[PDB]
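Schema walkthrough. Field components (list of strings):
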Amino acid sequence: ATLKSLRETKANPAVSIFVKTHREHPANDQDPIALKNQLKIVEERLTNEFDKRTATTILDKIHAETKEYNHKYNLDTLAIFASVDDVQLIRMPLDTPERVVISNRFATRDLVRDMASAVHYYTVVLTRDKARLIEAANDRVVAEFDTDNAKQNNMEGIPFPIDNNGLYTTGDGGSDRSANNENSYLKEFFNQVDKSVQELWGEHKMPLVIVGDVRNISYYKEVCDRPENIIATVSNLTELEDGNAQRIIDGVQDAVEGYRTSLHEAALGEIDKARGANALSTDLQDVYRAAFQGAGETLYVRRGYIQAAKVDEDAQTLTMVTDDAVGLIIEHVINNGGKAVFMPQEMMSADQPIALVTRY
Amino acid sequence: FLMPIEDVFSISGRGTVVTGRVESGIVKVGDEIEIVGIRDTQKTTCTGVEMFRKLLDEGRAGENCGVLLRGTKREDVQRGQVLAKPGSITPHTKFDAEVYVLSKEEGGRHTPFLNGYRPQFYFRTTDVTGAIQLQDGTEMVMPGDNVEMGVELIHPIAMDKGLRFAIREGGRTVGAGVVANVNV
Amino acid sequence: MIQVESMLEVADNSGARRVQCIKVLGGSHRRYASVGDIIKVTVKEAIPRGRVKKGDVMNAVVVRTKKGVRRPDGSVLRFDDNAAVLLNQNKAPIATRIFGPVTRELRGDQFMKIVSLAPEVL
RNA sequence: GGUUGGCUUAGAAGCAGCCAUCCUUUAAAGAAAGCGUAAUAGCUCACUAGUCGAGUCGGCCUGCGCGGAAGAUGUAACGG
RNA sequence: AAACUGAAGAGUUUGAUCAUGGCUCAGAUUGAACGCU
RNA sequence: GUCUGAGAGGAUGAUCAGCCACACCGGGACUGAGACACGGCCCGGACUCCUACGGGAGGCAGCAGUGGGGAAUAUUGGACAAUG
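Field assembly_structure (string):
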């Protein structure tokens, strides 16, 4: 059901069927037809290259499981991982092309992509009266750091939510309104908020997104202890005091996607560095060989590059069978401890859709 | 006569002009010439030779004359093909080459040339993906060696026995070759 | 003498008709641009469906001024308008026709096509 | 020298990490104290023999010093 | 002597019917294009 | 006139013939029997070109033909032998 189990499960044959699928109606009208077409493809493929008994057994096992599917609660892709024994049915957001892969292992490259796309971060919400802190992973709020968080127990700074109970906000103080110390007081309040954020970050380091009015964001920026840890600043999020934590998370999504895009833009420079050092392979067969013998450190794939090839394992040659040679290379790189990065089609040219930064 | 095509444009009332360094031979107004390479061979005739916005008497070897064509619609000619004397030079895709693999001191790669390698081949003014095919007894070519290999380009390229090309991967030179035989 | 917030007529065919100086370039407190000086402008009124649109920020070179330009013999040469010619992002002319005269201060390398396209060069 | 000790790991070879740290030829040499390698390679060290000739090596304690030691009108932190 | 010669309907609303009424079709024509030949 | 229609009507105005208007855009006229002149003039304009930078040249909606636009439309042919 998870990427771990799918990658660690072996079968013969193992069938991965990926069906293009829609969230809304009437777009989801074709999801039953698309699934049925994709199942016809695999039925005839299995009957052709294994036998009628294997084909009918696998297709019966997956039919019994896809009969329940509502098709009204579809995500943006429906993946089916079938063997003669077990059948797993997952709905992935991301994307994929309608394809049938039959091999000794499941086509888990799209799950690898989704896993490699994940970002875990803090969201510091600032107003002139209060600060909030939300821990987040992609689209969802992990925790909102209230008194019930139990990670604020040994806090030496003010724990979240930090209300601005400064002297000028209540009226005891010194230097009444004629002094015009509001900016200095608000600067120090955001400095203390930053102190709390840094205290909580020093145990669970991960980047922060600063959310709030443009003036508050900037006052915070010229006060933050580690301003180079800030990945994004969102100044058009609404109802920052009473709003839902999930609402804040939904607000920061354009910034988070921009940060992912910037991460790929940066990986461009890593490829150039490897090319200069002559430790980069871009030929498909060379990439396969280096990935197979554990020499691959970082694989870069054009996000949709799918090539079928006549892979020979013992002879260690690749010619153009395995329907996902790129997927097999991804699996080898992940297995031998390397990383996989799926770059957008405009960061990576269609001339060179794959690039392995090798270990030596 | 041969001239690789670098730039293609069209002038109203005059026709398609193909610019390029004339490699050899002579071209003058009225000469019949064929456009050989990438696509299928097509004949045509010369109507104008000009450079620096002035008409020239005839384009000779070395000079950068841009020759004008008759009836070519500027889409049947592209960067990479050669303007050649008819009959001379045939568009090939399978050719044997005496390829020397660069070492790591002249650029080159740290890994050998192995059968099934697909680098880009630059001949005169274009690069085309190829398919190195070593003969029997050779499985890989050590960086620094030189050997005869067969190449199956992805589209035809006009070549003759003795033309020098360069091999490249990722924009850096991985070897230099000279054609020794052209097969069909 | 052109300064920020000065309107200049456009002396080429790039579609703009009036530009406003928003920066005099080439110095941290530089006050004035004369002929041959590169300025940052916004185009304030352009012709419909031209190359340049109203509100665009771009480079120009001053090609004539009302203050005048001095010559080595001590003469001054003045014009009836302040006029610029729009430039690329690499400070090269984007003009195929130059309107009105220009001066020989544009002689050099980067404004040679302005000089050769002007109807007359003083 | 056994020997890339075993395990691990993509690798894992004295030198990522974990468990041993044994034997041999010895004058001596560690299942290695560093550098180095993707891992190897490589350069050292410990240790022994030779040369040299007389004192030398390392911890502990005490006294007085040194660095750590940047601010705003003028030296300007012995009153001179 | 002659120029004086010309006129077709079908399907589809209903459980079925008649009417109404639209839509569609069979013909002729072209400075025609396109597809196959 | 053409197509359709039994007709009445409906649609249409390629090729052939009559009439009109136009000749890169605006304006003025000259010469002449006749022009406000398609391959004439003057002035102005836009565009293309030449220039020694002072100044100049041009108008295929004639026949071929080129670029372009387009679903799409031809030869850079011959002769004045015939009718004019």
